[PDB]
């Protein structure tokens, strides 16, 4: 070492509460969740996204980086934002979600947004012990943050090792929590050389995370893009803070398919 990402991590861990809270939102895109969250409080089950995740995935999908189709397996679906988002797409026929749930984890939130009937969200499931099934689309947003870059390296590599057997010339969108550490990068290079795809940064991600996403469509230099992200996040430290770009939250409509 040390990578630019590790420097970013260093500096991040050196921030105070105020500096952190102003940095994490500085210059990023975020969707207005006011109405969605108020609606969810009133117990509404149409239109609303159960979390910020639906828009986060929509960013990828609208750019054709991942194109959900056929049977969609959403590992670690949590509340179900990605599953509920995919349920509305014409090419999607089945949505199957597994999440850990229980104490300390988000349960699947039952909704009646457009296409809910083709969605099955299952809790009490450790995806790491789940036998890989046949699917046309594989999603994965797993990766628990830590102040230690190395702990994150371990968790990340564990996630990649878990998801690889699910990949079969199919669409995928897979969260890479810590992409700047060297062993993760070699692993990703091997994975890319076997299954293709590219690492891309989602603009709705906060500056407080170096997370990138291994998506199935397109190609590129991984190390170059990771370091590109690193220099961006570093620049945003010294950049006069910019209030985030507020965008419309996704609307998931209503009805069965």
Short mmCIF file of C-alpha atoms in Angstrom, two decimals, residues 164 167 169 189-196:
data_model
loop_
_atom_site.label_atom_id
_atom_site.label_comp_id
_atom_site.label_asym_id
_atom_site.label_seq_id
_atom_site.Cartn_x
_atom_site.Cartn_y
_atom_site.Cartn_z
CA UNK A 164 -19.91 -16.17 -8.14
CA UNK A 167 -23.51 -16.34 -12.37
CA UNK A 169 -24.15 -15.72 -18.77
CA UNK A 189 -10.13 -8.84 -12.27
CA UNK A 190 -10.44 -12.62 -12.25
CA UNK A 191 -14.23 -12.43 -11.94
CA UNK A 192 -14.35 -9.94 -14.82
CA UNK A 193 -12.18 -12.22 -16.91
CA UNK A 194 -14.59 -15.12 -16.28
CA UNK A 195 -18.01 -13.41 -16.36
CA UNK A 196 -17.31 -10.02 -17.95
#
